[PDB]
Amino acid sequence: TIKVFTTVDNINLHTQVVDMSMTYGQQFGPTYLDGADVTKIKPHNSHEGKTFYVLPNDDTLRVEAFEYYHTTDPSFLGRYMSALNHTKKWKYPQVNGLTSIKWADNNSYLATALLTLQQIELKFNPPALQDAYYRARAGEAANFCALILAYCNKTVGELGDVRETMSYLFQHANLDSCKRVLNVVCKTCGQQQTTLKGVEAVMYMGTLSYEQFKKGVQIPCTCGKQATKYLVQQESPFVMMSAPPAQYELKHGTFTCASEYTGNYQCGHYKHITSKETLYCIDGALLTKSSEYKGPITDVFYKENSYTTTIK
Ligand SMILES: Cn1c(=O)c2c(ncn2C)n(C)c1=O
Ligand SMILES: [Zn+2]
């Protein structure tokens, strides 16, 4: 017999005596050793003392799992392991001071999401995610990428959407106190103010221009006229403005960073544009600098703190 540790978080370890005549799966359920699936394997003597991950299959492990990952989805950990086997083999070059990802397995959407996160102010609430995120910021991003895939219910190689991805991640970020107040004005129906909080206060779908959002965008009214919607008040460290991809000119110094999307739902590619002393296009491991940029932009990120309209 051998003594080992089992765990769901590699924080709380639990002693186990292992029967060498049974596989790990027969004793523990699906079981991983340093990420390798050992479910169908007989214990080796050399495994004595090692730490194994298992699926949360009792109350203690379930609570520990929830406390570390902030999800009760029982398939989460298996999904994470499957992703991590791949993301450990990706490469994470430093590009223009940021951790990027060299292209692999259609991962451009994860690269531009990671590049974006390093330019906006945000903290993740699940300890697993915030821990992985700080390692990713330093260049060791495999765990962070596998968690993102797991949180988004995506597998390695699946095409992804940055906006959807950002939405899921923001739901695990402390945006609780972010606030947006909007006003919609119809000459017939009058004015209707709305207040949004959390993730809905920092994401908008329909226009890339933050300035246009402040000035007012035309939206239809059920009465049949065109109403105007504009931003009354914003309280957040950034905003995300998105729209269906379309040719768009990005101007140095008017935005923080942006996502460009080429292709369709069957085959496509993201690039990342950032505004520094000039414009930089980060494309996985590739870097290109230019003073102007035009492309099929789909998300633009802007810094914010507090904004109040002067529209009376
Ligand atoms: C996979 N892939 C694409 O699919 C792609 C692209 N540029 C345009 N497209 C569509 N690049 C650079 C790419 O690596
Ligand atoms: Zn109306």
Numbering used by the authors: 4 to 315
Paper text:
Of all the trials to crystallize the wild type and mutant SARS-CoV-2 PLpro proteins, the SARS-CoV-2 PLproC111S (4–315) construct gave the best crystals, allowing a 1.9 Å resolution structure to be determined. All of the residues are visible in the electron density maps. Although gel filtration analyses indicated that PLpro is predominately monomeric in solution, PLproC111S crystallized in the space group P6522 with two polypeptides in the asymmetric unit. These two molecules (A and B) superimpose with a root mean square deviation (r.m.s.d.) of 0.65 Å for all Cα atoms. Thus, there is no overall difference between the two polypeptide structures. Locally, the angle between the N-terminal Ubl domain and the catalytic region is different in the two structures, suggesting the flexibility of the connection between two domains. Four cysteine residues at the finger-tips coordinate a zinc ion with tetrahedral geometry to constitute a zinc finger motif, which is essential for structural integrity and protease activity. The substrate-binding pocket of SARS-CoV-2 PLpro is located at the interface of the thumb and palm domains. It contains a conserved classic catalytic triad (C111–H272–D286), which adopts a consistent conformation among different PLpro proteins. Mutating C111 to serine did not induce a conformational change of the active site. In the apo structure, the aromatic ring of Y268 swings away from the pocket.
